């Protein structure tokens, strides 16, 4: 039913977060921002307040089609330290649902807490050394179909990442229609249009 | 002294444009103040994301800042165009010799419609190109018109380029390149940052 869960924490990368939410809303998805902890507002890495609509403990995977995890170093660490967040990764993945993560999160959450063991993934370049060398992708956006896992690198790949999520969940045609107004760099747009064909 | 940037927000402001601007400028060590149009400090962005301002726009003065950065969003830009305070503030910044920057809907729905930066080259979102006199329209992703200290840009996908250009103009290309370095820009998005 085109429902996306976007956890946020103190220290989450706010432009990554908002790019994800906004882009998915443009695609007609119902996006829920859910806070780690017991305060619904959390302060992003660069001071921007992120106002969630519910707490992460109130979330259950059957209410969503996909999980999208922002980066930021402090935010990724907060995710890694959250019992509920780690459990949601397990729940989504064991329901066969797309899990998507960007920036520090694949390194500081997945690699550190044994999530998506054996999956190809990328992350922020400053954390490449956290990923097993034989599994590391240097793609700006990396999809690993076997474990329904989408990863990406940083603030400057966030739009590409969110559009790839749309392509996977709802088809490249909708992703292309959502991308056109956004004034992507021509290279970004070309790579989106070819993204599903490349699978 | 660290550069001070005013970022007005309104109901319907484009939240990814807004947050890209704020985050990127904070990465440069700048002091960034979000200020809300209307009587509430929290305003809902175009795609539902709540933006929490620190203070009211209507009590801001240009004297307290080094530059003004205006997000887009159709509803937000319309709110800006309907705000006497916002319009007078644009002129105060310009007449104090300061950079005024705007992206997407705003150069069309605010500057062109409310007769700001007459004579200036500017860009805007492609869907508003018809609002800009043909002899002044730039189709550049980022357009700087130095005579009037005016920086404009096109859309969500140009917002990072736009904010980096602001850093370059205010504090030098070295700082802009340092801020850009870890952010995983597409390599081709970084080729003209060199020359602001
Ligand atoms: Cl809009
Ligand atoms: Cl970064
Ligand atoms: Na106000």
């Amino acid at each position: 039913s085109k429902r996306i869960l976007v956890p946020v924490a103190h220290g989450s990368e706010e432009m990554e977060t908002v790019i994800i939410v906004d882009t998915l809303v443009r695609a007609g998805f119902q996006v829920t921002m859910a806070a780690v902890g017991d305060k619904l507002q959390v302060q992003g890495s660069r001071g921007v307040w992120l106002t969630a609509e519910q707490t992460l403990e109130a979330c259950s995977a059957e209410a969503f089609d996909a999980l999208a995890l922002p980066g930021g170093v402090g935010g990724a660490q907060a995710f890694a330290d959250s019992t509920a967040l780690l459990a949601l990764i397990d729940a989504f993945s064991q329901q066969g649902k797309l899990v998507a993560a960007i920036c520090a999160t694949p390194a500081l959450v997945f690699a550190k807490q044994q999530k998506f063991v054996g999956a190809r993934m990328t992350c922020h370049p400053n954390f490449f050394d956290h990923i097993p060398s034989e599994r590391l992708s240097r793609q700006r956006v990396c999809y690993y179909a076997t474990q329904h896992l989408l990863t990406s690198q940083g603030p400057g790949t966030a739009l590409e990442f969110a559009l790839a999520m749309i392509a996977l969940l709802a088809g490249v045609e909708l992703a292309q229609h959502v991308a056109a107004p956004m004034v992507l760099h021509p290279q970004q747009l070309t790579e989106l249009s070819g993204f599903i064909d490349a699978q």
Side-chain angles (χ1 to χ4, degrees), chain A residues 1-111 113-199:
Chain A
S1 326
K2 306 178 274 57
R3 305 154 300 169
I4 316 295
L5 179 58
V6 182
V8 294
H10 184 198
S12 292
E13 218 300 331
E14 49 268 76
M15 86 180 244
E16 295 172 10
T17 300
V18 174
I19 290 166
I20 293 159
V21 171
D22 183 326
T23 303
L24 293 167
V25 169
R26 288 168 174 249
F29 299 174
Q30 292 292 122
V31 182
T32 300
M33 299 179 64
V36 174
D38 307 297
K39 293 223 142 62
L40 281 61
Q41 70 177 32
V42 299
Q43 194 163 31
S45 64
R46 277 70 184 182
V48 174
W49 288 94
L50 298 166
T51 295
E53 71 176 76
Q54 65 199 53
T55 190
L56 201 63
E57 270 188 20
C59 295
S60 291
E62 81 284 344
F64 303 97
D65 300 301
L67 179 64
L69 303 180
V73 175
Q77 293 287 19
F79 288 173
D81 294 338
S82 169
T83 305
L85 188 286
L86 297 177
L88 281 164
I89 294 166
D90 297 341
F92 274 86
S93 64
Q94 291 167 28
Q95 293 178 14
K97 292 169 175 175
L98 183 63
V99 174
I102 189 164
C103 183
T105 293
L108 299 184
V109 183
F110 302 161
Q113 294 296 332
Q114 298 76 43
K115 308 302 184 190
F116 302 101
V117 178
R120 295 199 54 78
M121 62 184 72
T122 196
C123 63
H124 193 281
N126 289 342
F127 292 94
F128 281 167
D129 68 345
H130 285 52
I131 309 306
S133 57
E134 187 274 339
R135 299 282 81 195
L136 178 65
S137 173
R138 294 173 175 78
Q139 296 157 280
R140 293 174 69 80
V141 179
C142 174
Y143 182 55
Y144 186 68
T146 304
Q147 293 185 44
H148 308 104
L149 179 68
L150 184 69
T151 55
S152 189
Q153 297 195 13
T157 70
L159 185 47
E160 291 156 77
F161 167 76
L163 291 163
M165 286 186 63
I166 295 159
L168 289 164
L169 290 168
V172 78
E173 181 183 3
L174 181 57
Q176 291 171 314
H177 282 256
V178 170
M182 306 185 73
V183 202
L184 279 67
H185 186 281
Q187 283 293 297
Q188 296 169 316
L189 187 65
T190 293
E191 292 184 358
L192 173 68
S193 292
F195 178 67
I196 296 300
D197 285 346
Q199 311 313 312

